[PDB]
Design a protein around this ligand. Structure first.
Ligand SMILES: CCCS(=O)(=O)Nc1ccc(F)c(C(=O)Nc2cnc(N)c(Br)c2)c1F
Length: 264
């Protein structure tokens, strides 16, 4: 049964990330390792980690980063598949990658696909954002960094945070819809190739404004080749009240419907 990977069985290479630091390595080929790089967690910390891992093993889907095993000994770690490619953030916002409107819609679809899964598997991402969506072989969407919702509790996502989330209002804001609004942001990201509210330099003012929903994203910044129904859905996914947002079944429905009336 247990996916534990004993000491020496992994060989860590060059360094990548910086909530857990990410290393590339080799374990039956190239693999990603996120070492939690805490110092030495005591027996009831150990148990809650194993608890979070158990939420990963619940996952088997092409649009979901492949959980390949965890480590305890050398350090606490989660090993996944290594992706060839670059994050959706990196394409859109660093190397200014220009995607055909058709491939944009597919990435949308793929991403909504992965979510609809996690949601039926009663998972909530909590931090769905473009720097967290890989584009593999430049064709396949892999959602990641949604594990460990307990190990963190026990900043840099403000843009995707739904109102209810943003204003640190109650104990649990995070819903399925929370994730749905974060989707609306990635939708806007795709259809505009731009981060929202870029004409504002004072962070806190965003945080304030969104929280009160005086400031929402600017639909009218979508590139013209964006489908009429794509706009309608983006807007549907960004509604200020969370009960008004649709759930991934309906989102997926709407995407697969408009994409079929597209290349024609
Ligand atoms: C997918 C479930 C595990 S999780 O904790 O939600 N996410 C998670 C866990 C461990 C990881 F190394 C990663 C990760 O980012 N891997 C990763 C894979 N491939 C590349 N090229 C890079 Br750069 C990073 C990751 F996204």
């Amino acid at each position: 049964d247990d996916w534990e990977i004993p000491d020496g069985q992994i060989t860590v290479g060059q360094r990548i990330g910086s909530f857990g630091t990410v290393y590339k390595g080799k374990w039956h080929g190239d693999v990603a390792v996120k070492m939690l790089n805490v110092t030495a967690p005591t027996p009831q910390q150990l148990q809650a980690f194993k608890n979070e891992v158990g939420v990963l093993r619940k996952t088997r889907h092409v649009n979901i980063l492949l959980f390949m095993g965890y480590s305890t000994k050398p350090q606490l770690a989660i090993v996944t598949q290594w992706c060839e490619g670059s994050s959706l953030y990196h394409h859109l916002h660093i190397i200014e990658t220009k995607f055909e409107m058709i491939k944009l819609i597919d990435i949308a679809r793929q991403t909504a696909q992965g979510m609809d899964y996690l949601h039926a598997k009663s998972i909530i991402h909590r931090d769905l954002k473009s720097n967290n969506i890989f584009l593999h072989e430049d064709l396949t969407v892999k959602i990641g960094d949604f594990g460990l919702a307990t190990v963190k509790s026990r900043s840099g996502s403000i843009l995707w945070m739904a109102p209810e989330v943003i204003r640190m209002q109650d104990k649990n804001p995070y819903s399925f819809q929370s994730d749905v609004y974060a989707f609306g942001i990635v939708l806007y990201e795709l259809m505009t190739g731009q981060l929202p509210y870029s004409n504002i330099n004072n962070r806190d003012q965003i945080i304030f404004m969104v929280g009160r929903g005086y400031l929402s994203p600017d639909l009218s910044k979508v590139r013209s080749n964006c489908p009429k129904a794509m706009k309608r859905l983006m807007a549907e996914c960004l509604k200020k009240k969370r009960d008004e947002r649709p759930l991934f079944p309906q989102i997926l429905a709407s995407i697969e419907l408009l994409a079929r009336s597209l290349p024609k």
